[PDB]
Amino acid sequence: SDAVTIRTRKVISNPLLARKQFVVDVLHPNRANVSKDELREKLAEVYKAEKDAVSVFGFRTQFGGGKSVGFGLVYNSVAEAKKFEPTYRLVRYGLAEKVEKASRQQRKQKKNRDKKIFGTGKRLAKKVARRNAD
Amino acid sequence: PRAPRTYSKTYSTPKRPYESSRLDAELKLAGEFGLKNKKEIYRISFQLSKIRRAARDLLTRDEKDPKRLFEGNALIRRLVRVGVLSEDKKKLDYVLALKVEDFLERRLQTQVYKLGLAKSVHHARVLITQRHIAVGKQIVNIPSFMVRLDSEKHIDFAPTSPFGGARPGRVARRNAARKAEASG
Amino acid sequence: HGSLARAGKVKSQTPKVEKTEKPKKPKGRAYKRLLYTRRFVNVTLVNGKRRMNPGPS
Amino acid sequence: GKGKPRGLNSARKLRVHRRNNRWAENNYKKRLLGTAFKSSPFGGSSHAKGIVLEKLGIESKQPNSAIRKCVRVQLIKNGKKVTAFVPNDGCLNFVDENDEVLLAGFGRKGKAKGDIPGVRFKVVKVSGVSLLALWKEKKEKPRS
RNA sequence: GGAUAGUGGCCUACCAUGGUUUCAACGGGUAACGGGGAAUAAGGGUUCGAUUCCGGAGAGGGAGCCUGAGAAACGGCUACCACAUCCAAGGAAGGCAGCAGGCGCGCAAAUUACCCAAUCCUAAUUCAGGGAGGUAGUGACAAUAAAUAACGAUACAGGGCCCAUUCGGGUCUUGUAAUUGGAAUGAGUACAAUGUAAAUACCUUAACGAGGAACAAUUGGAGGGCAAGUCUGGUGCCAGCAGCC
């Protein structure tokens, strides 16, 4: 807000993904670092295009601070933005809801067990129950 | 797996560990240029030997050789970029006889003492190591920076540095606040 | 001779003397500056051979 | 003609003569015969662990008269017995019994160092703790 | 002629002692995978190359094979030797030199974590998977710049220097304090922050954070090679030191 002076370089528009790509630069003295959501809000309020169509990531701060350089993406529409953006980036932005999956070790263990079990398995469960009953 | 990342040494130990004259020379040089180790002298001597070997291998080739002309032009261009060679003499004697004294007196830490920004070599050294130096819009804390005459118009203190301004300092704020509280 | 003894003789019979408390020495560039000052700019003893430990005569 | 053949086609003669006369060099012969891997006590290795066995009635070289101990050690990988020299003052505290000691060479690539005749190795570690650590009292050998 | 996908003693019938060899054949050894390739020179180069790339080989060793475009495939099958995963004693079934990890072997080498996010792979494939790979832990194998501090009244240890009222003032300013200070910062606790979806490691920030019995630099330790201890105690060819003397 106080003389951040967000600026953009190497702005190239590709209709192939219907987006515009650039390297963005922020000159923000007396700051820790400019957050990506704050950058998105600034780009939205200065371009009057869209809120969720602006992507900013990377953002290394120069040694001694005061300036940061990162990568920025703007999208033709929110539909295309959600069609092309990575799921992790969308979730980190908050545009997407996080998935509920177990650890990879548990998933691989489960795949091993269900490759050991052939078919549906209900017949095996019923047979085991009857064997216990007898 | 991944391609290896090449790493090279930057210094060389003398062949004789205890030469009285060499030890006196190195200690005097490091005392007058404010160096922390003989490894700095070793590094600068290493690059000096590297460039002298380059010059000798260039003079190896016949006169008016395209590779000789190109490579000599590149080496002299870098030497004048770092600013040691004459801007109007292409006589190459300095090229064949650059000196450790020249390299250190060109190095950054002594540059501050030469231009008069710290008035002491060690005070300079401690200023760079405490990062109150900015060659441009960037802050460097390395004494061995070897400025290239280009930032001379732009040398200043950082705006995120105390005694550069807009900030009292970690102990300055405490001392001023306690003085104000005591004075009432 | 009767010399079936004294394995570790002097190390056992030496007196335990503790290192005296003295101020810390400078480390790094400060130590090198101290050496340079004590070596060159000083004129303590340059008469015969510029010796480094001027023992009492 | 200075001995050696000089003809432009005498390269085979020169190579064969050099091959024959390389063998007069002490280190080349050892390297090409593998004497380190066949008859060196350490098997061509920098260091070797061992178990200290007993006392032997040996005498030091000039000038002294000292018969207390010099550690006979049985190596683990070879099973060979070598005499090692405990390299510091106060040797008594570390030679208790059946200890495991790490041995290095004396530095002369397989030869005795000084006034100690027939000893080519020294001790650096006693049961995994460094001998000069015990000598300087900065670490303690395992007493429990 | 057969077999091969194909030439060919690769094998079958007849015909010679034909083929190699001191220009080193054959045999033996290699603590020998080969090459690209570290360490030096305008040429003496001597070693090493298990190892990031390429070509080989192997999946405990030999042998045999199915499927398959492609395999003599061993995280595919068929047969022993050391070894096993087991009972309720009839069995079923063979070797992590893939990643972690364990035990022996040793002088000698990491965690039984995370992720398909950055790079590539596969037919039915924009969506799946990958211990390939990346990341996170140990790590002083190496490699880069580099914290350990910068100044006042006083004297002392006294470079270059002046005022012709002979240690007075000292212009410029080399260093030291057991008597003392308005000046600059690193290591970390951390909400804030990133190439991480929930994160400690890198510079940024409220706060805590410097006074030297603080947050403390070691390793070799001064005969010669290679400068300096005849300054002080203990032993007295003894303990020991010493790569050589």
UniProtKB/Swiss-Prot annotation, chain A:
Gene3D superfamilies in alphabetical order? 3.30.70.3370
Spans annotated as Disordered:
101-134
Tell me where it resides: Cytoplasm
Q: Which residues carry this modification: N-acetylserine?
A: S1
Q: One MF term in GO for this entry? A: structural constituent of ribosome
Cellular component GO terms, alphabetically? cytosol; cytosolic small ribosomal subunit; mitochondrion
Alphabetical UniProt keywords:
Acetylation, Cytoplasm, Isopeptide bond, Phosphoprotein, Ribonucleoprotein, Ribosomal protein, Ubl conjugation
Q: Where is the composition biased (Basic residues)?
A: 104-114, 123-134
Which GO BP terms sit in this record? Answer: cytoplasmic translation; maturation of SSU-rRNA from tricistronic rRNA transcript (SSU-rRNA, 5.8S rRNA, LSU-rRNA)
Where, per the database record, does this protein carry Phosphoserine? S13, S55
As for PTM, the annotation reads:
N-terminally acetylated by acetyltransferase NatA. Also partially acetylated by NatC.
Question: Where are the residues linked by the Glycyl lysine isopeptide (Lys-Gly) (interchain with G-Cter in ubiquitin) cross-link?
Answer: K20
Q: Which HAMAP family match?
A: Ribosomal_eS24
Misc: There are 2 genes for eS24 in yeast.
Job of this protein: Component of the ribosome, a large ribonucleoprotein complex responsible for the synthesis of proteins in the cell. The small ribosomal subunit (SSU) binds messenger RNAs (mRNAs) and translates the encoded message by selecting cognate aminoacyl-transfer RNA (tRNA) molecules. The large subunit (LSU) contains the ribosomal catalytic site termed the peptidyl transferase center (PTC), which catalyzes the formation of peptide bonds, thereby polymerizing the amino acids delivered by tRNAs into a polypeptide chain.
Tell me the protein family, please.
Belongs to the eukaryotic ribosomal protein eS24 family.
Record-given protein name: Small ribosomal subunit protein eS24A
The organism of origin for this protein? Saccharomyces cerevisiae (strain ATCC 204508 / S288c) (Baker's yeast)
UniProtKB/Swiss-Prot annotation, chain B:
Q: Which Gene3D superfamilies match?
A: RNA-binding S4 domain (3.10.290.10)
User: Which segment of the chain is annotated as a signal peptide?
Assistant: none
CDD domains from the UniProt entry: S4 (cd00165)
Q: Which UniProt keywords apply?
A: Cytoplasm, Isopeptide bond, Nucleus, Phosphoprotein, Ribonucleoprotein, Ribosomal protein, Ribosome biogenesis, RNA-binding, rRNA processing, rRNA-binding, Ubl conjugation
Which GO biological process categories is it annotated with?
maturation of SSU-rRNA from tricistronic rRNA transcript (SSU-rRNA, 5.8S rRNA, LSU-rRNA); ribosomal small subunit biogenesis; translation
Give yes or no: UniProt keyword Ribonucleoprotein: yes
Tell me where in or outside the cell this protein is found: Cytoplasm; Nucleus, Nucleolus
Positions of modified residues (Phosphoserine):
S183
Molecular function via GO = rRNA binding; structural constituent of ribosome
Where's the Glycyl lysine isopeptide (Lys-Gly) (interchain with G-Cter in ubiquitin) crosslink?
K179
- Domain S4 RNA-binding residues, every copy: 106-180
Where it mainly occurs, coarsely classed, is: cytoplasm
Subunit architecture: Component of the small ribosomal subunit (SSU). Mature yeast ribosomes consist of a small (40S) and a large (60S) subunit. The 40S small subunit contains 1 molecule of ribosomal RNA (18S rRNA) and 33 different proteins (encoded by 57 genes). The large 60S subunit contains 3 rRNA molecules (25S, 5.8S and 5S rRNA) and 46 different proteins (encoded by 81 genes). Interacts with snoRNA U3. uS11 interacts with MPP10. Component of the ribosomal small subunit (SSU) processome composed of at least 40 protein subunits and snoRNA U3.
The record's family statement is: Belongs to the universal ribosomal protein uS4 family.
What's the protein name?
Small ribosomal subunit protein uS4A
What is the organism of origin for this protein?
Saccharomyces cerevisiae (strain ATCC 204508 / S288c) (Baker's yeast)
Gene behind this chain? RPS9A
Swiss-Prot record, chain C:
Question: Which species is this UniProt entry from?
Answer: Saccharomyces cerevisiae (strain ATCC 204508 / S288c) (Baker's yeast)
Q: What other note does the entry give for this protein? A: Present with 37600 molecules/cell in log phase SD medium. There are 2 genes for eS30 in yeast.
GO CC, alphabetical: cytoplasmic stress granule; cytosol; cytosolic small ribosomal subunit
PANTHER family, A to Z: 40S RIBOSOMAL PROTEIN S30/UBIQUITIN-LIKE PROTEIN FUBI (PTHR12650), RIBOSOMAL PROTEIN S30, ISOFORM A (PTHR12650:SF15)
Q: Which gene encodes it?
A: RPS30A
Cellular compartments annotated: Cytoplasm
**Its principal location?**
cytoplasm
* Name of the protein in question: Small ribosomal subunit protein eS30A
This entry's Gene Ontology molecular function terms read: structural constituent of ribosome
From Swiss-Prot, chain D:
Q: Which InterPro entries match?
A: NA-bd_OB-fold, Ribosomal_uS12, Ribosomal_uS12_euk/arc
Q: Name one GO cellular component term.
A: ribosome
Sites where 3,4-dihydroxyproline occurs are at: P63
Q: Which UniProt keywords apply?
A: Cytoplasm, Hydroxylation, Isopeptide bond, Ribonucleoprotein, Ribosomal protein, Ubl conjugation
Q: How is it modified after translation?
A: Hydroxylation at Pro-63 affects translation termination efficiency. The stereochemistry of the 3,4-dihydroxyproline has not yet been determined.
Q: State any GO BP term from the record.
A: maturation of SSU-rRNA from tricistronic rRNA transcript (SSU-rRNA, 5.8S rRNA, LSU-rRNA)
Q: Does the keyword Cell inner membrane apply?
A: no
- The question of whether Ubl conjugation is a record keyword is answered with yes
Q: Which GO terms describe its molecular function?
A: structural constituent of ribosome
Compartments annotated for it: namely: Cytoplasm
Describe the task this protein carries out: Component of the ribosome, a large ribonucleoprotein complex responsible for the synthesis of proteins in the cell. The small ribosomal subunit (SSU) binds messenger RNAs (mRNAs) and translates the encoded message by selecting cognate aminoacyl-transfer RNA (tRNA) molecules. The large subunit (LSU) contains the ribosomal catalytic site termed the peptidyl transferase center (PTC), which catalyzes the formation of peptide bonds, thereby polymerizing the amino acids delivered by tRNAs into a polypeptide chain.
PANTHER family, alphabetically? 30S RIBOSOMAL PROTEIN S12 FAMILY MEMBER (PTHR11652)
Q: What is this protein called?
A: Small ribosomal subunit protein uS12A
Originating organism: Saccharomyces cerevisiae (strain ATCC 204508 / S288c)
Species classification: Eukaryota, Fungi, Dikarya, Ascomycota, Saccharomycotina
